[PDB]
Design a protein around this ligand. Structure first.
Ligand code: ADP
Ligand code: MG
Lengths: 52, 77, 76
């Protein structure tokens, strides 16, 4: 027994890590706007439209 | 400034100066770790009380002055 | 100096019940001294000051409510 499957391919782990990193980045970006003490964000589009 | 011009017609320079001064001083409080919600709450109460104080102690009825108040008001503008 | 004198006159108005006539003291820019602006004929509509406070406060509140800006690059 001992050793199991080798799992030669490393791409799936990298893809999972990148997906998690992106999701965590988005969550951290929008964390500041949560709750009664949360604060708004100002977003300016490419066309120049501004939204708070 | 446009909104004051359309809805009042006068005091356009005052409102821009006051608003910028209000925001400038509000940021100083925020830099002192005062939460903006507290600053916003304070500004809202002050604006509500300023209007109430004006309408109760700083208004002059024009019926006591006749035509001269209109000329004086026009001259001031 | 002028604002200090102007504030001092108004301070007495709100603390002395017999000196309420000082509420009308404003500024006389020709001579650079405080002056009774109700006697001087310097008047404004009440709506001008009231709407100025309401509009400026809301505009200041709107900007104060921001704490993060994202500026997307133009699509061109
Ligand atoms: N004769 C005067 N003496 C002293 N102060 C005055 C006189 N006329 C106007 N003012 C003041 O000057 C200020 C500036 O008004 P002004 O800038 O002309 O109006 P706006 O902001 O619509 O341009 C007003 O708040 C008014 O109280
Ligand atoms: Mg004017």
């Amino acid at each position: 027994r001992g050793k199991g499957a080798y799992q030669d391919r490393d791409k799936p782990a990298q893809i999972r890590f990148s997906n998690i990193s992106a999701a965590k980045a988005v969550a951290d970006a929008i964390r500041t706007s949560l709750g009664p003490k949360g604060m708004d964000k100002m977003i300016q589009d490419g066309k120049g439209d501004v939204t708070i | 400034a446009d909104l004051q011009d359309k809805e009042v017609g006068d005091g356009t320079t005052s409102v821009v100066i006051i608003a910028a001064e209000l925001l400038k001083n509000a940021d100083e409080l925020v830099k002192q770790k005062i939460h903006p919600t507290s600053v916003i709450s304070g500004y809202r109460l002050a604006c509500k009380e300023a209007v109430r104080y004006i309408n109760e102690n700083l208004i002059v009825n024009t019926d006591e002055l006749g035509r001269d108040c209109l000329i004086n008001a026009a001259k001031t503008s | 100096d002028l604002v200090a004198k102007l504030r001092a006159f108004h301070n007495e108005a709100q603390v002395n019940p017999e000196r309420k006539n000082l509420k009308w003291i404003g500024l006389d820019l020709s001579n650079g001294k405080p002056r009774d602006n109700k006697q001087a004929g310097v008047f404004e509509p009440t709506i001008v000051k009231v709407k100025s406070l309401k509009f400026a406060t809301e505009a200041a509140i709107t900007i104060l409510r921001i704490d993060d800006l994202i500026k997307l690059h133009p699509e061109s």
